[PDB]
Design a protein around this ligand. Structure first.
Ligand SMILES: [Er+3]
Ligand SMILES: [Er+3]
Ligand SMILES: [Zn+2]
Ligand SMILES: [Zn+2]
Lengths: 296, 294
């Protein structure tokens, strides 16, 4: 009677440097937050947690509109360690907790945290994308299936967390976009979803290849002022791409194996299989975030 | 009368973020235009114009791009200040100028008292004697309005007001360093021709007794240019001292006005370190911290 094949789910959330009006921005992690959920005992473990500020190297001074959005003050990032150091602490934390790779999974509220943010930051820091970041549970996508299954209803909230909270009629915990408060909301929503009979398992995988990247991107000249169109650019720039999987077709043994090429994930990923050369040739209108990360 | 054979009109643009004044401004454009004094000749063909790549804030905020007009690509293909600065140094020698016989000219005290001084802390370059005496064109202008009589001016910036007064057309666009530079040379020209005393009127000094007493702290300073000025004044080792029109003398290069020492001696340490400002690590001063002032 556990649909969820993992013993422990790790609710994950990143906050990043940003500049609202500009999507051609090299987001760097400024907050790394995780809270554990005990699957067999159905318990949110608020005492098993990871919560560190991260110091950027590219944009060391937080945009004012970034501190208003995230609530993070400049002092907390000036005393923080850089990402390579905070990432290694995280690695160390997993170890002390005795988590067997492939028997835990990360839970996020959208594709953004792992497909975009982890990938890009990891490129900046020259760290290989780990297997446990290459499969995950997009809780928003399970949520949308749960709506279809139980009955859609009118939602006024604008964020994924907000909507889920509204639909299950849960009270918002803390403030929006404070990473740890985001984690506790997600954990709570997740717990509610499970008690309502949802099957919570990995639904998104990161993959070297997609056939819709075979067709070149039809370029929007004004992509820098739109989150959606910038997403499309990120999709072509980043080596890995999101492939979905149905709940019944997922297997724990897929861990560490690329869904597309079937190679091990210590091999797959090391070079871009679909480099978007068509976007890298107009030297007059360059993509800043691709340049600064060394994609060209 | 004006004791310099050649005047160098210097302007900087920096990284910024309009609504945050606790910001580590970095040079992104460095422009200079020569002015021949004996020939009264603005020399547009003797110039320095370079973009500079930041290291703290590599991505220009949108509002910085809007304000300065500089696009991200021009900064991504540029060298860092240390390289651009050695280029500037190399360019100087090209001009064959006699030591202490040229002076810099700015529209305000910002370019050299704040921007150069701070950038040069970041880059670990010693503040040069020729940046510790300069001509603040606006102060002279202020004085020219007493002599020649006032006007009600609706213009908004130092360069704007001066152009309005001397009834001069705006050259190029505001906040392009070179465009700023040309307007300043042009204004400088009319001023001299209308009878202005043009000389070094501002000196950079190790010490001033108005930093003896701690600053009256304003919790909301980060949203005000004026109030952030006050804290910049305490953080930076060198402070602006004023010298009257007739009083400057060529051989003041480069001895510090306060302590009378050579400007290789005076200059190394901060003689008035504002310890009282560096005590509340629940409200720290970001620009002082990234620069290593504490
Ligand atoms: Er978040
Ligand atoms: Er300027
Ligand atoms: Zn693959
Ligand atoms: Zn001195």
């Amino acid at each position: 009677y556990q649909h969820c094949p993992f013993d422990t789910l790790l609710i994950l959330d990143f906050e990043t440097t940003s500049d609202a009006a500009n999507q051609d921005y090299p987001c760097e992690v400024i907050q790394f937050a995780i809270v554990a959920y005990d699957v067999p005992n159905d318990k949110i473990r608020e005492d098993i947690s990871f919560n560190k500020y991260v110091k950027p190297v590219l944009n060391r001074t937080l945009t004012k509109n970034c501190v208003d959005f995230t609530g993070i003050p400049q002092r907390s990032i000036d005393t923080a360690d850089t990402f390579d150091v905070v990432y290694e602490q995280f690695q160390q934390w997993l170890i002390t907790l005795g988590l067997e790779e492939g028997k835990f999974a990360f839970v996020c509220d959208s594709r953004q945290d792992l497909w975009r943010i982890a990938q890009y930051q990891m490129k900046l820091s020259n760290i290989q994308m780990p297997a446990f970041f290459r499969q995950y549970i997009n809780l928003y996508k399970i949520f949308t299936n749960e709506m279809d299954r139980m009955g859609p209803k009118e939602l006024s909230a604008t964020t994924n967390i907000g909507k889920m909270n509204e639909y299950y009629d849960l009270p918002t915990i803390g403030r929006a976009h404070d990473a740890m408060d985001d984690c506790l909301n997600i954990a709570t929503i997740l717990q509610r979803m499970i008690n309502m009979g949802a099957k919570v398992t990995v639904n998104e995988l990161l993959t070297c290849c997609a056939s819709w990247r075979r067709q070149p991107l039809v370029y929007n000249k004004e992509w820098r002022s739109s989150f959606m169109d910038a997403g499309k650019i990120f999709e072509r720039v980043l080596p890995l791409v999101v492939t979905t999987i149905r709940a019944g077709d997922f297997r724990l043994e897929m861990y560490g194996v690329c869904r597309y090429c079937r190679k091990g994930m210590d091999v797959c990923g090391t070079s871009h299989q679909q480099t978007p050369h068509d976007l890298y040739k107009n030297e007059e209108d360059p993509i800043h975030f691709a340049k600064i990360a060394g994609y060209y």
